[PDB]
Symmetry: C3
Subunit: 448 residues, 3 copies
């Protein structure tokens, strides 16, 4: 259900029919691994079977110790947030007196419990790995019985499997300085994360969304290492919560629109700068200028509101009439007529200027269209590639209807003699008022 319209008048295109999944806030959950303190490693004896357990135990002890030492266009308009301020703030609460004992006591009988913290916040807790009981009750007795010798290779391997996850958690936190993204399957296994989602205080619609897109949920999550206190390692996994789901979204593609004069430098250029993603959101429209921060799975767009501006619904009018009076559409102006192509959701916008060769090709037929100078467009139906100069573009092969909206290029309505060709953060009305002021300066001087 994806459609696209090419506006030849403004050298732009809109892909519509996408569904929203906007991160509006954060959930913080506490993931704990229970460890055992190893006091006296009195094993000597250079025996092949003995050496492996002793070296494996040193790996565990070193990893525990290693973790303890760790504690000791238009994008520029956007604001700046503190991505993990929410998760880290929960992490500071865990350093308070007795805060681990609440967690540790609540996770005594089950691996999943809701803990009320000292500040009042209720947080999911999750014991994902119990190394204490394995070492204290199953390994050390077996190890001790035969004087630091183990007569069964299967016991050393079972320990390597148990120990491996803690080793990789440490490995990730040591090169990521205690905050990772995405949340790897070592920090949170696939089944654990699904259990987190099913127990979160969120909608059934929300749970379904997160559960069918765990690969995206990881990518929008942080894992923040926290404490190794008492006999427990805890880290906070900061998961995105999607407060806006299933509202309509559209992607605006824009490209340079220039005159087609024969004189090299007599040309004028004009580009819509408002490129990016747009989603309906609470009666307004969330605008995401850097479209690379959004991830598209099939027809759903996952974006993050911290990278958005909040705009009136009338921003959509820039697609139907760039000179409409209700919203001042943003553009930049230049004298730089260079050829390029913008691959859209359902086709290719081609800005072909000068002597550059611009064509569109089929896999079975070769070149099927040669572009004339100006901004033109091609659908992904008969076309597989587009070539602009020495640049070959592949076109998206997603199915869907394109509509070519015929229109006179807006750049023709400007007189090159009064055109301001150095505006990067301008608009329809700003360029108008700059021409009018430059045209009145030229009219009043002739009346002199």
């Amino acid at each position: 259900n994806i459609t696209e319209e090419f506006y030849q008048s403004t050298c732009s295109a809109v892909s519509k029919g996408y569904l929203s999944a906007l991160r509006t806030g954060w959930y913080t959950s506490v993931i704990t691994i229970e460890l055992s303190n190893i006091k006296e490693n009195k094993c000597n004896g250079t025996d092949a079977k003995v050496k492996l357990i002793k070296q494996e135990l040193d790996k565990y002890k070193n990893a525990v110790t290693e973790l303890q030492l760790l504690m000791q266009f238009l994008g520029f308009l956007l604001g700046v947030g503190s991505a993990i301020a929410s998760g880290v703030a929960v992490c500071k609460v865990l350093h308070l007196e007795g805060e681990v004992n609440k967690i540790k006591s609540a996770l005594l009988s089950t691996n999943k419990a809701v803990v009320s913290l000292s500040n009042g916040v209720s947080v999911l807790t999750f014991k994902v790995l119990d190394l204490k009981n394995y070492i204290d009750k199953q390994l050390l007795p077996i190890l001790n019985k035969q004087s630091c010798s183990i007569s069964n290779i299967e016991t050393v391997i079972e320990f390597q499997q148990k120990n491996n996850r803690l080793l990789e958690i440490t490995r990730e936190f040591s090169v990521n300085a205690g905050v990772t993204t995405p949340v790897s399957t070592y920090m949170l296994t696939n089944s654990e994360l699904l259990s987190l989602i099913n127990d979160m205080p969120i909608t059934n619609d929300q749970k379904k969304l997160m559960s069918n897109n765990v690969q995206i949920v990881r990518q929008q999550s942080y894992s923040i290492m926290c404490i190794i206190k008492e006999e427990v390692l805890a880290y906070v996994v900061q998961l995105p919560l999607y407060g806006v789901i299933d509202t309509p979204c559209w992607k605006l593609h824009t490209s340079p629109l220039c005159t087609t004069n024969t004189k090299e430098g007599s040309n004028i250029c004009l580009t819509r700068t408002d490129r990016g993603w747009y989603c309906d959101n609470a009666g307004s429209v969330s605008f995401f200028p850097q479209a690379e921060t959004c991830k598209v799975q099939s027809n759903r767009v996952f974006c993050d509101t911290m990278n958005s501006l909040t705009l009136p619904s009338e921003v959509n009018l820039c697609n139907v009439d760039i000179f409409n009076p209700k919203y001042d559409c943003k553009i930049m102006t230049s004298k730089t007529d260079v050829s390029s192509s913008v691959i859209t959701s359902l086709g290719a916008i081609v800005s072909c200027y000068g002597k550059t060769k611009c064509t569109a090709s089929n896999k079975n037929r070769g070149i099927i269209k040669t572009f004339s100078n100006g901004c033109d467009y091609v659908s992904n139906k008969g076309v597989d590639t587009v070539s602009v100069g020495n640049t070959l573009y592949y076109v998206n092969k997603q199915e869907g209807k394109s509509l070519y909206v015929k229109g006179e290029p807006i750049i023709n309505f400007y007189d090159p003699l009064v055109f301001p060709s150095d505006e990067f953060d301008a608009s329809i009305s700003q360029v108008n008022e700059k021409i009018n002021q430059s045209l009145a300066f030229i009219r009043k001087s002739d009346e002199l």
Copy 2:
């Protein structure tokens, strides 16, 4: 072999003698892993070796299930592509009815075959891991014989080794949402990648280039997850093919050039904006502004043409005469007189202005040159470091001849009273015409 020239007139430098290897297109290959779906693990019982086999199978069974849930300046001129549109398109073709079986039957007897897909395109296929046959014909018969008990721990390891690759593949696809780059060695081993290149429909020069730089080929490749259906897991590996090789290429380094009067704010500044890589390509010049997107191995430059502009060959004239009439050299203007240094391929450019302390040092001598205000340059022969203010630069110690092209700094030729110092995307002639137009308006008023 490799040479460099510093143009004192324009505060820039060009490194010559580099060879091209431009990514111009894509090859997509289908890499398959054959799995066996095992319904239930009906051997529930305690035994050291049995317990390991059960956990190893449960890790394997979850891996299949986890995969199944997975499937359910001047840079701003470059334009936008769809980086994996080619591979993703091939991925969709594999979803058509019976298309997997065409692949599967062709790879029954060998691990490498060329398959003609339903849309007609021929794509190399590659069975890299046969777990179905291993589990169905080697492990499950051994396991079943002794009521799921194995008298050989070596059986567990061989399975845990075989299974390891499938587990890591799932790990990569699970945090990358099915698209990874560079292509890891779990997705494609070094030997498998060399075997693909040897069987690809490319030149012997092309096969040689890709084979001697497999680390680069990986870094420029994508691995696109496709289907896990029937007894086949398949993913598409999208490799870059280098259609332009061994053409002369050069890198342009630029730095700001300003006046050096003692009065703080009476100064004017000028910078060439066309820094980046330039390669001859099909009679034209491919310009890469973003020099970070290019990889240099020794003397070969690996760039990607979608991050390029296609420019006329006369761009190279900006280096011999910035005021040439045949190509309008791009520049920016400012009043921001800040000190900096730009390290070149063979030396160091120094923009030293105001009261900033700028020196060049030798390891055997200490400071050997102190820069005066203005733009200056040093060769890498006797110099190891360069210091501009509080920042120490190390110089590349690559071997090669340097040439200092003496010339009067271009900034002296402009009148400070009429100089337009707010142009970001301007040029020699644009600054000329804005001065001439601003100089004539003051001439026309004085006639009064």
Copy 3:
């Protein structure tokens, strides 16, 4: 310990009380893994145990062979060559007999200081001895028992020794021989702590690097070097912090606009000099891209190559933006958009037009509704801030914030002569452009 001032006059805030740790130079160290080239594996593949060591041994040879086959305002900063230093050390190692010096000095110990031919002395470190493991412990066991191994523990011990060499190969194979950060497979934590401790640096420096090894990794490079004779060597390029314990402050800026009701009648102005500022050697190192600096508690790890060197008078933009001694940087626009900049101890809120902006408490919800204009809220009673459809969480680090009241500076500009497309301007640039455009209006009136 940490304080913050909000300047309502210029819609900005400064957080002070940070201490510096500026990377100023590089230490290059040579890390070696000793390998053994194995001629003929003319064993049998019948016994289950032999197959594993033989296949594990084939795994090793491929890794050895594979490695041989391998052989605002940011735009002002300038260009460096990040690993020119370590690569320079690597190039020296290709010279005749220079590898033997390394190998003979690490004959008896695993750590040695070597003097290179060009005269520079570099710490050396043998981190893995696979040659000796294979030559003296594995291959002798193997041949004796008729090319078969009767102890499963022997194969695992080899798979463990070999595993690191395999994982190193995976990393250089995917990184084209230059990695960052330096992984724990390239340099284990104990080795890195030993390297720092044996480095020719201050005790203040060693303590700093040793308590922050995770940051030392992130600022380090591993440059794959040579595989010649019986040794693989790679250079680990470590950051040395030549500026420590000087005051640092972060400047946060947000747009400051007029608040007329007429849609497009508004004027805007924002300070562009946002980023980190640290005193060092009588001047000020300015870091515009604030994402390249890492904060641990109250220490700011920055890299001087991503910095400008500024006169100490830059701080005057915080006491009076119109000072004549330093021309403060600004950008000007007519784009009256709402946003928020979260600072160390609070939230700057630029709320304009019809956008809904509130500050909320976890126990009370909305506790302040902002009026149009640029305002600021301390992180004390506030946990979150919402500007339009975006909820920001505020930093909860403890510290005092002070609200400096003032008339917004944008009100001192006349809307008729205001240059509204200046990105790299200044107080003095906009002043003289008003004079030039306001005087041009006088010539017609005197006419």
